[PDB]
Design a protein around this ligand. Structure first.
Ligand SMILES: Nc1ncnc2c1ncn2[C@@H]1O[C@H](C[C@@H](CC[C@H]([NH3+])C(=O)O)[NH2+]Cc2ccccc2)[C@@H](O)[C@H]1O
Ligand SMILES: [Zn+2]
Ligand SMILES: [Zn+2]
Ligand SMILES: [Zn+2]
Length: 231
């Protein structure tokens, strides 16, 4: 019933207004890139203008970068035509945040999304496994229902609880239709959601949310459903 679009979140005044009549999620800090505490060229042959004209893919599936899960930079053999800079160009799919029967807010496809399609970056604060643990107990002491945690690399856990983006409304499903993929962008590892199937317009977007220890009941609906979240 109550949905909103990506751009609803860029006005804090308007949003906190919609927050008070439950037509938008609880407020948080919207970010495009990741917060921290401190922290090599493509090899495809160029396409012509003749080949740009029929829309044939620049740095498509045969690209040494793409295949190592490393995004091109500005100085790539296809430059602007290069299609393997999806993170940097924020080439996100069309998604609305929706309200789910029992899961809190969720994410649905506003159009048909083909398989292996960049949905969004999971952005947030990047913590070392000390900070993260302090935070887990801080949040358990706060009795926060929801949990916005994810491992990135050894001693690097991304926490969207306070600061983050609409990727954090992605819900679990024991039979999902997206997966995480870890990508390098200027030698900084980044993590985005990518579709694993042909999600129809209107359908909820879901992944296999894996995490440590009150194990939460799972309402994914799916047949052959674990029954609880975790691992
Ligand atoms: N099948 C399900 N049954 C029951 N509860 C479910 C559920 N799937 C999701 N939940 C609820 O979601 C919380 C986490 C969610 C917030 C989304 C929530 N809807 C909200 O409104 O904030 N983030 C996940 C995440 C983490 C890191 C990167 C990306 C995503 C859970 O702790 C659970 O409460
Ligand atoms: Zn290439
Ligand atoms: Zn390229
Ligand atoms: Zn389930």
């Amino acid at each position: 019933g109550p949905s909103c679009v990506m751009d609803d979140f860029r006005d804090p005044q308007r949003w906190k207004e919609c927050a008070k009549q439950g037509k938008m999620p609880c407020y948080f800090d919207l970010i495009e890139e990741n917060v921290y505490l401190t922290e090599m060229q493509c090899e495809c042959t160029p396409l012509s203008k003749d080949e740009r004209a029929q829309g044939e893919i620049a740095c498509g599936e045969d690209c040494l970068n793409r295949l190592l899960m490393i995004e091109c930079s500005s100085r790539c053999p296809n430059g602007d035509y290069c299609s393997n800079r999806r993170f940097q160009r924020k080439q996100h799919a069309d998604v609305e945040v929706i309200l789910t029967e029992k899961k809190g807010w969720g994410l649905r496809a506003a159009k048909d999304l083909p398989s292996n399609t960049f949905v969004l970056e999971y952005c947030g604060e990047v913590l070392d496994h000390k900070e993260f643990k302090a935070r887990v107990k801080e949040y358990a002491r706060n009795k926060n229902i929801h949990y916005y945690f994810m491992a990135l690399k050894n001693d690097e856990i991304i926490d969207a609880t306070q600061k983050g983006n609409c990727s954090r409304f992605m819900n679990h499903s024991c039979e999902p239709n997206c997966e995480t993929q870890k990508w390098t962008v200027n030698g900084q590892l980044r993590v985005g959601f990518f579709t694993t199937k042909l999600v129809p317009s209107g359908s909820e977007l879901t992944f296999d949310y894996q995490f440590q220890r009150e194990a939460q009941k799972c309402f994914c609906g799916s047949a052959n459903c674990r029954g609880y979240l975790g691992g």
